[model samples]
Target: SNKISATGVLVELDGDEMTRVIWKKIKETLIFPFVNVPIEYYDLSMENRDKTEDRVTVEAAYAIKKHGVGVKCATITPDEARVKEFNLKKMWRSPNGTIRTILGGTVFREPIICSNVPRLVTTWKKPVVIGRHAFGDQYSATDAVVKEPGTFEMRFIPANGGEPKVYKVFDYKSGGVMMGMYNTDDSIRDFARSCFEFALARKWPLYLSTKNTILKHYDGRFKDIFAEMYKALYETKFKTCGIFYEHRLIDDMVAHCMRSEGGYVWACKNYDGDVQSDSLAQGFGSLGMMTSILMTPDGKTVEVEAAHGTVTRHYRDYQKGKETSTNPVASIFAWTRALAHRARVDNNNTLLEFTQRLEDVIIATIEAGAMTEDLAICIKGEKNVVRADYLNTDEFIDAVSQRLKVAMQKSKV
Candidate 1:
């Protein structure tokens, strides 16, 4: 068996429990057998992270910065329960949050569509890629509850020793709540550029959604920045690609998304992205089918992963020697997407073709009724799904491996 030799190396970030188990199976069955590529591996498992005091996560992010592409498994973000379980030093921050801060980029969540899988919104024949501006706004907001009557004001103390400007936000005649959020023009501009670059690559139209009508200056800055960047940097490129960029009110855009076929990119603010991505995931189908890609503004760097978390329930079940039908499609795509990006960067046609074929094989295998319990539940209802309805975790990977073997042979013929 001849494996396609890749031109470059991949930054592979191994992750936690059930996903860690599936990740190994995926590489052995789907990746190593088909492609010969150098990998800079980082063990981001819970035990290793605790042992290293989470410095491994930082180092992994830097490795990805040095390299252009990274494929990450779903890692455990420690909470109180996780801290007790892992017996860690302190509750570490989210690995993704740390990585995203180190590598400033937009995270796009796109659903993997299989023909057999039914979408709740039947009109969504294609994918509605959500480009989330994962930078500022609500995530970093300052908020407080007012206990007594007072005036709420925001003061801007200029760094150049200029006169301080204070604006009265509101007068609290009674007890109420107030919150303040901010975003930088540089961050917003980078977000716009990333969205434009992503949409152009897919040859899809891009829409920026915001409540600029209500929050005039705040949301208006987002709308204005995207429009300015599009005109200055991407207008001609978009035209050549036969796509356009537009801004729409959030309310209107939500309704439009429901009715239209999902083929375009929707660039969202931090809060909107947080809400809409989960809504879109449920509307499309199972969360197991969602793939996440964090693409930098320059479109030169990407970190791919499963949008779903490590299947802790399944991991727990497996610990008791129970057979679990955990879905590995998203994890598999993390590698395929990473390889595809590597191919594009290296201009390796053979490697590119292999990635395409592998993606097709995955979809084909699932569509042909070789799927996991989650997707089988999506097809057959929860009460209707049986043991025979779907393959176990290993069986599903083997099914894809068999189909890929046949696909490679047919391509040669």
Candidate 2:
């Protein structure tokens, strides 16, 4: 055996009710036993966030930025009802949004591939990584229901004491909806660079989605910027990897997504990503199998997280002394994804092998009939899942532990 050390990582954990409970099990059972390494832990637990007035969220993000690789547990994004229920502090913004602002670039959702996870598209044997350009479009817009008719137009005001730039969302058409949105040239450029950088790193062909046919100046700018960036900075790298970059209309992208087997990254704008990711979750048949990563344009830093929430529903049952079957796989993979990137960056083949081997153990164990209710139900589909098909929550995590240990031991030789 070789004496080798794994890369260091910052684990930022936060989650909704049910998922919060699973997060702890993942750290304790699935992770701690297999690989021994120093992990900087941040308790992004909602109670602490509310207690600390959300400053803890920012601190967690800053820690990840400082460390360059982070694995996160999904946390609550408060809503109006949540605000009232929590009662006290102002309605807080999503912690993820705040983190994205500090650490620029895109959030990519990738589904995990498992042998027993029956996909909606049965032919898809590999993962389809969806990179959401988390900027502009409807998210950065002034939207309102129209009251009366008015002239709709845009005026460009020059900088350096020149004309101002403004646009009207609705004109003299029948009053139904009106909205105004614009993307900064600078932001669009950065988004394009991030997507290109991701494709080059993964050596996967990249496809960007925009409704350019309908919104020429609006969505077309996204297409144009990516095309230009590919030509300028990434042409050589893409060619070297035998990959290509192309733009597709959003509608077509969605239609193709359902039918295609995937081995490429799809670059989606804000709204499309919000919707399409949900589609992929269903297609993959389990949210428990999605791993999320936020990558900056330079590809120098990344934050990995579970795409699903903290399992609050199960947590309440857990509190009530009832047995629960919440799955902890995605949260565990957050570490695997982050550390795998660290391995690639640091050139530690051992770490990379550990990443895949750990993942394989998870999949093989699950396929061998050890999983929680969700994945078991997805696989069985006809009757109540037998105890043999799934372990209770704790037993399931123990299963992951046993598999991880066995895999690591075998890989040594």
Candidate 3:
């Protein structure tokens, strides 16, 4: 790649386990070789987080918000077993979740598709971007078991002394459970705006999925908010971009998604977004290709990282002196996407073009049959696939770097 003068700084969030190894190598091979950029680094390794009482995660999130761009490696989120395994001071919440909360944005995940890798759904030629409304709903619901049969009611009271409004939700004849979920108009509006900004950025049509027909008042709020935003904020802008936004019932949306040759953005509610994005990842073939990005409503701030975990199994094999073919493409994109955003923010076209070239080389490398084992399995059947077919983790990164250099040479001519 062509050497370019780097301007602006990025909040570089270093992470844990196997993905961290790939993150460092990717920066050394692909980034440092071509562009000299400044980074405000944060060590978000689990050990460091434990030492800091997880204060580092909060600081890192604020740094990203201030700097406007961040690239991250996959960090570990501990369960009870992981807490015992790591010997933690406290079970730290996911850095991704914390950062998303602090930044207040939509998490959009898109898969990198290559021609050689066969998708489970053959019709998906283009990328399907899934934007998730990450706040409230089931994730923030209040629930309890009813010990005795009684009338269930929801009440809202004013801060100043006033008459309380109470509505009977149910008259329980038998002991059962009840749950109450709510979303603020502010949050719903931000979600709508973020989806519009994201779809406008990608220049693709947007779809919001909800079961409004079933939950008239509850889900209807979501539909009403999006419709209001479309008329007031997004519709004219989308028309300018030659794109559109529509509301879809969850069932109908899933069916439409299955048949379509993907090229649009789907904005989903918190609960279903959690479930559907995973299914989409599998259909596309590998989690290695899944890229997660958090974009602020203004499209100014962004945090990019791989959607997959730290690859603990692969790291174990690597420690045992066996070469493991862990995929690094998603991690590589984490850097490229962050830097590309920096380039855009800083008004550096050379750096922007350089990032694009590096990404093209990655896609080219995969298309030319140089890939890691995960994708290799997607193309070659499990029984037939062997060692010679795909390059190991380090070797695949090396392949991408060399391919980038070759592309740079051609550009010079």
Candidate 4:
């Protein structure tokens, strides 16, 4: 059997739970038989993370830096309950966050649309790509609950022994809560560059959403950076591509997104992207259909993964020896997207075509009515869906595998 060859190694991060079960099946049934690539594997499961103290996560990120591409499985970010359940040494931070910090890029989530899957917003035909600035803001905030508040102040003392600047944020009379969040100019610039580069690649218009009117200095910096960069760097290139960039207030942007047809890239701050991407996932169809790619500012390195989690509920059902129909589309695309990037970087058209064919086959398989419970529930109402309505995990992947075989054969012909 002939397999598509790859030049560079792919950093493969294994995950946890039901998705981990599905992840193995996807590679075995869909990937290994079709492509031959060197993979540097890392087990990022909860148990292994505990044992390694999450150094594996850092190692994996560096490997991605060396290899230029990675495909990750969703790992658990433990809360109190999870900490107890996993018997962790200490509660660890998000592996995704660690990886992003090392990679220093924006995360873009795009929905995979199939013709048969009806969207909640009927006007949306194309995918709404969301490029989230994952570096700062609420994710890296300093907060305090003041039992007896005198004042809330922020101080900036110079590293080089210059005079310190202090700003009194508030003078509180009673108990209250206060938080300070920040973003560096450099990180914001990188975020802007990534959004512009991504939009330009897709030839889609870009919109940066901010509440600059309210947080004049805070959010205004975001708006100003993106706008300045567009004029200085991307404006001419955007014109050549027949695309443009604009800024919109967060509220106005949300309203516009709800009403308008989807074909553009939305550059969101960390918090807004976190909230809005979920809504976009539901609006398009399911989180199962959402594919996430983290691209560095320079457009060279990327780490691809599913936008969804480990599917703990489905894993519970599987562990109970009950039937489960967990969706594997996003996980499958994680591989495809990673390989596609590898192909582009290596200038390997054979590998590139293979990725495209695999994507087409997956979409076609869903369109032909081979899907999981979540998608079936989307089409037929939840109460209306029956056992016969959808395929179980293995069966659905098998269907896609069979279709992929035929599609690859046709490509050979």
Choose the strongest candidate by TM-score.
1
Question: What are the Cα lDDT values of the candidates?
Answer: 0.86, 0.77, 0.86, 0.86
Error of 2 at 242 (Å): 3.5
The better candidate by TM-score, 2 or 4, is 2
Using lDDT as the yardstick, the better of models 1 and 2 is: 1
- Provide the RMSD of all predictions against the true structure, rounded to 1 decimal: 1.8, 2.8, 2.1, 2.9
Q: Give the per-residue lDDT digits (tens) of candidate 1, residues 62-131.
A: 9988788899848687888778885678978889878988887888988888788898888888988998
In TM-score terms, candidate 2 sits at 0.89
Which pairs clash in model 4? none
Model 2 residue 313 lDDT score: 68
Please write out the lDDT profile of model 2 over residues 287-396, one tens digit for every residue. Answer: 87888888888777788888777656677678687788777778778877777887787777877777787788888878787878888788876476566677887887
TM-score ranking of the models: 1, 3, 2, 4
**TM-score per candidate, in order?**
0.95, 0.89, 0.93, 0.88
CA lDDT, candidate 3, residue 292: 90
Model 2 residue 303 CA deviation in Å: 1.1
Candidate 1 vs candidate 3, lDDT winner: 1
Better of 2 and 3 by lDDT: 3
In TM-score terms, candidate 1 sits at 0.95
